[PDB]
Design a protein around this ligand. Structure first.
Ligand SMILES: CCCCCCCCCCCCCC(=O)SCCNC(=O)CCNC(=O)[C@H](O)C(C)(C)COP(=O)(O)OP(=O)(O)OC[C@H]1O[C@@H](n2cnc3c(N)ncnc32)[C@H](O)[C@@H]1OP(=O)(O)O
Ligand SMILES: O=C(C[C@H](O)Cc1ccc(Cl)cc1)N1C[C@H](CO)[C@@H](c2ccc(Cl)cc2)C1
Ligand SMILES: [Mg+2]
Length: 411
């Protein structure tokens, strides 16, 4: 049923996952020395390629492969369109490893045909809290804590095979060669997410959307007018009214984040992310990289009164291509990123997120039900979308957890 995934060090079924009680590796410990020095064999018409991301033309080639061939919704109406500026930001965090960005080009023309990217992440991934309770009841605390310390692993994203190359078992060859390159740097675990079911997730969560520009959403058929609104003389006018927002933020000390805020934002974020079983650990340089505002890419605001940063939120932009509509070419979506509240309720902090995103011209705000994203779904008028996002590890046994125990945002 799975010719590739059945050969890989991942839990194979749900009931296998069910017998997992401690975090730890699936496979045999291995060394760099054991790993083949040479690239995995490939068909003689293709060649491996390592793009240079601090070079404009290389970023542009991967930008076009993704523009034309990356994730679509299920009836081919929208396709993600990550910008070039976004891709440099996402692929090049501090101390990234250039050879973990893995491409396949056609030899004859150098046309990009496939891509996969890995980046460093420091991740807490020790036995979850509920399994530590079950462990103490059994007398098994030591085995439960063996992998408690944060691990330097790989986060995978941007797997893409050209449309003309689909269903030829190319994705396995990409994944094998990524795994070899990661293993050649003495890294043995990866974390990845997908909107498809594979063997075998450790957590799953629904998608959620908050309409900001409802007349445009209905026009492009992102949204419909729901049935209930027909009882009204003017269904659309009442839909606009339901989703209207203030013009300016409600929290008085709200302002954009600046370099001097890095230490306080790091502090309050890390204190918050501690409450979750699987969560990233960020250095000052990584807080700077992922949170300081960047035009058209990432937007981050702090609440400061009395010269302390006590709360913040962030969101990132990804436009999607509207696969041809007469009036509109692009859906401009804002995605909830990291946040922390210490002085005001989480709903009151995120309302300011919606208000900023709306004033800056975003059409919809999107998020998965990770972190504490549930505490504000009803009052802030988010709705559940279609399907689920699934979270996975590579070479890591892990007890099933709820998505509200997951704190890793995947860009
Ligand atoms: C220690 C370091 C390790 C690092 C690596 C860790 C693992 C990283 C894993 C990657 C995490 C990526 C996270 C993301 O970026 S999720 C985003 C994935 N990208 C898209 O959905 C973009 C549009 N679609 C495509 O570009 C292609 O359809 C892709 C590339 C997805 C598949 O290409 P194609 O359709 O031409 O198929 P094939 O004949 O070549 O290959 C068929 C095999 O591929 C398995 N398949 C299908 N979809 C996925 C998927 N999303 N993750 C893992 N495997 C997937 C499938 O079950 C089958 O195996 P098996 O069932 O026969 O066994
Ligand atoms: O899991 C990932 C990264 C993964 O390798 C590739 C992927 C891209 C899109 C989707 Cl659909 C699923 C998986 N995501 C990237 C998406 C954009 O940041 C993010 C998302 C958030 C909220 C909504 Cl409502 C929809 C999507 C999920
Ligand atoms: Mg293929």
């Amino acid at each position: 049923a799975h010719a590739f995934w059945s050969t890989q060090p991942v839990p194979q079924t749900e009931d296998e996952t069910e017998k997992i009680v401690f975090a730890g590796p699936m496979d045999e410990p291995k060394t760099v020395a054991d790993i083949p020095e040479e690239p995995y064999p490939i068909a003689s018409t293709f060649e491996w390629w390592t793009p240079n991301m601090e070079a404009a033309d290389d970023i542009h080639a991967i930008y076009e492969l993704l523009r034309d061939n990356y994730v679509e919704d299920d009836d081919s109406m929208f396709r993600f369109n990550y910008s070039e500026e976004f891709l440099q930001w996402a692929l090049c965090p501090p101390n990234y490893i250039p050879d973990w960005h893995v491409a396949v080009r056609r030899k004859a023309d150098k046309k990009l045909l496939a891509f996969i990217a890995g980046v460093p992440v420091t991740l807490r991934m020790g036995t979850p809290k509920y399994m530590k309770v079950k462990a103490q009841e059994k007398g098994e605390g030591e085995e439960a804590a063996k992998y408690d310390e944060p691990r330097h692993i790989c986060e995978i994203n941007f797997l893409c095979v050209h449309k003309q190359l689909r269903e030829k078992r190319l994705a396995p060859i990409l994944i094998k060669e990524a795994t070899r390159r990661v293993n050649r740097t003495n890294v043995w675990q990866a974390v990845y997410t997908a909107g498809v079911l594979l063997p075998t997730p450790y957590a799953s969560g629904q998608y959620f959307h908050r309409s900001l520009n409802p007349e445009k959403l209905v026009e492009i058929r992102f949204s419909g007018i729901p049935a209930q609104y027909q009882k009204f003389q003017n269904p659309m006018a009442m839909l606009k009214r339901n989703y209207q927002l203030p013009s300016a933020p409600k929290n008085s000390g709200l302002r954009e984040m600046k370099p001097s805020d890095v230490p306080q934002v790091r502090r309050i974020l890390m204190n918050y992310l501690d409450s979750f079983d699987v969560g990233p650990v960020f250095s000052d340089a990584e807080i700077s990289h992922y949170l300081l505002p960047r035009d058209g890419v990432v937007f981050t605001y702090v609440v400061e009164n009395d010269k302390k940063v006590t709360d913040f939120f962030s969101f990132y932009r990804i436009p999607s291509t509207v696969i041809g509509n007469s009036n509109y070419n692009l859906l401009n979506a804002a995605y909830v990123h990291y946040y922390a509240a210490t002085s005001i309720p989480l709903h009151q902090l995120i309302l300011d997120l919606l208000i900023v995103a709306h004033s800056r011209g975003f059409d919809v705000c999107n998020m998965v039900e990770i972190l504490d994203n549930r505490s504000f779904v009803e009052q802030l008028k988010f709705g559940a979308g279609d399907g689920h996002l699934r979270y996975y590890f590579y070479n890591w046994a892990y007890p099933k957890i709820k998505p509200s125990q997951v704190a890793l945002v995947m860009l």
